[PDB]
């Protein structure tokens, strides 16, 4: 029988993973769906696990893909193969209409929510080191985003920082109007992709052949509308 490859994603992030009626959707997943489609090889199961455990099912090989708006770091592709980017989605800063934190450096002294393994964790430990006088305080929780937004809406916490997609889009359909978002500098393209084990090459391969051919023929773009609610697709030239 066909190869079974396993996806592994939280479904907990909205645009990019969640059920609807009980069954996983969102950019990730369909976009994948869509890649897959194309294929009389690999029969893809998609399954919802935790965050920390999508990255060590990918070293056990229990899973061969890992999708959940991913971003680059090297800690991450010392370990797993990326694919080429799937969407940009940059950072902004999550806070109550008229706060007091206007810019990222008035973060200092405030608190927040942190998920273990995510990006924003070492930047905001490079922020304290770089702010020791006057440190975030970071509240290490294993609660979902929407949780941590209405958190934020509800004064448990003074600002949250993800990325702008699932930002505004939680504020929006969960209708948080008393939060804005502020646009943070960006080290780097803030581009968000799959992940693979890493013995996974050839699986890597063929992902990467239908990225561009979905690229270039305006699927992804279709898609990108469809789930993030924009075009948010990475430069052609990183394609
Ligand atoms: C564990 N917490 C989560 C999701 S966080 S893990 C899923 C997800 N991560 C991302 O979207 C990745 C963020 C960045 N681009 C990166 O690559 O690190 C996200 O929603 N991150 C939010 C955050 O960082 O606060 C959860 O589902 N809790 C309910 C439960 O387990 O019982
Ligand atoms: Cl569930
Ligand atoms: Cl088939
Ligand atoms: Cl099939
Ligand atoms: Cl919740
Ligand atoms: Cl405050």
């Excluded at 209409?97 to 942190?114: C, E, F, L, R, W």
């Amino acid at each position: 029988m066909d190869k079974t490859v396993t996806l592994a994603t939280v479904g907990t992030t909205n645009p990019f993973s969640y059920e609807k009626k009980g069954k996983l959707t969102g950019y990730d997943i369909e976009v994948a769906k869509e890649v897959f489609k194309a294929s009389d090889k690999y029969d893809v199961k998609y399954q919802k696990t935790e965050w920390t455990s999508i990255f060590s099912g990918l070293d056990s090989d229990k899973y061969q893909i890992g999708a959940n708006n991913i971003s680059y770091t090297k800690e991450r592709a010392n370990k797993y193969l990326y694919s080429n980017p799937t969407a940009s989605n940059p950072l902004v800063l999550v806070v109550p209409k008229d706060s007091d934190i206007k810019s990222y450096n008035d973060i200092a002294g405030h608190s927040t929510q942190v998920v273990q393994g995510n990006t924003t964790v070492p930047m905001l430990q490079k922020f304290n080191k770089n702010h020791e006088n006057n440190q975030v305080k970071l509240n290490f929780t294993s609660e979902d985003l929407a949780h941590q937004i209405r958190n934020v809406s509800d004064g448990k916490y003074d600002f949250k920082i993800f990325e702008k997609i699932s930002a505004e889009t939680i504020i929006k359909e969960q209708g948080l109007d008393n939060l804005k978002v502020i646009d943070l500098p960006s080290d780097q393209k803030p581009y968000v992709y799959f992940i693979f084990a890493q013995d996974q090459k050839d699986l890597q391969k063929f992902v990467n052949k239908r990225l561009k051919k979905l690229y270039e023929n305006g699927t992804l773009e279709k898609l990108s509308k469809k789930y993030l609610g924009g075009s948010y697709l990475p430069d052609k030239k990183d394609m």
